[PDB]
Amino acid sequence: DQQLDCALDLMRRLPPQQIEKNLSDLIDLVPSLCEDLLSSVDQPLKIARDKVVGKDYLLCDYNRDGDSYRSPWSNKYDPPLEDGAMPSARLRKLEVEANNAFDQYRDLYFEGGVSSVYLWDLDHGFAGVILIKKAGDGIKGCWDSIHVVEVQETAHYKLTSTVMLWLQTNKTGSGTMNLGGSLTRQMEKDETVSDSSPHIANIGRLVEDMENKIRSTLNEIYFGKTKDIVNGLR
């Protein structure tokens, strides 16, 4: 309603680096908006540790059941759950292949960070989320990407992607410079499915094209605009 529109507008104006605090203060302010706010606002990704296989994974609502979260590596919930929601045996097999595929994608484009892939069934076809988080080592910053894909079964693919990206430098001439923000894009197309062009190859090419175009847009259109604005202020 009107309050939700005000809350979403507020989230678009407040400093993007403090989105978690602003979201928490917002829900503290109007508790009834909690479910709608969390359904409409993407948050920076949080890392959890799969203590069984010794690997990091990313948390979101798609791999949550109650207060537990499902690891993409072990297919187990932490804290353990008796009957936690699980993908079908067939989807789990594609989920394992997708996590292996996107871990290499993450390694080649990010040279670090953490990735996680979760898939779930739909009435006709399936959907999934691809999550990537890469922080800087040490100037500093963080990249968070959330790709939501829907596969309608030659299949139709729909991709909704959000990238959250902040960067800070501390230098002698320019002092402290902080750039933060986000971009949300969408792409859809039809692709033939076969042994040589499987679902994950189709999804990977879509995610690869999306992140490359979003990265170029963040660099050229958005960051370059703030530089022009600064040169116009004085």
Binding site: L59, D67, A85
Partner: peptide
């Protein structure tokens, strides 16, 4: 702007923040 797909099913509870 086309709609996102529905999330997973299974009565998984309400959305919440992560500390």
């Amino acid at each position: 702007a086309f709609a996102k797909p529905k999330g997973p099913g299974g009565k998984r509870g309400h959305k919440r923040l992560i500390r």
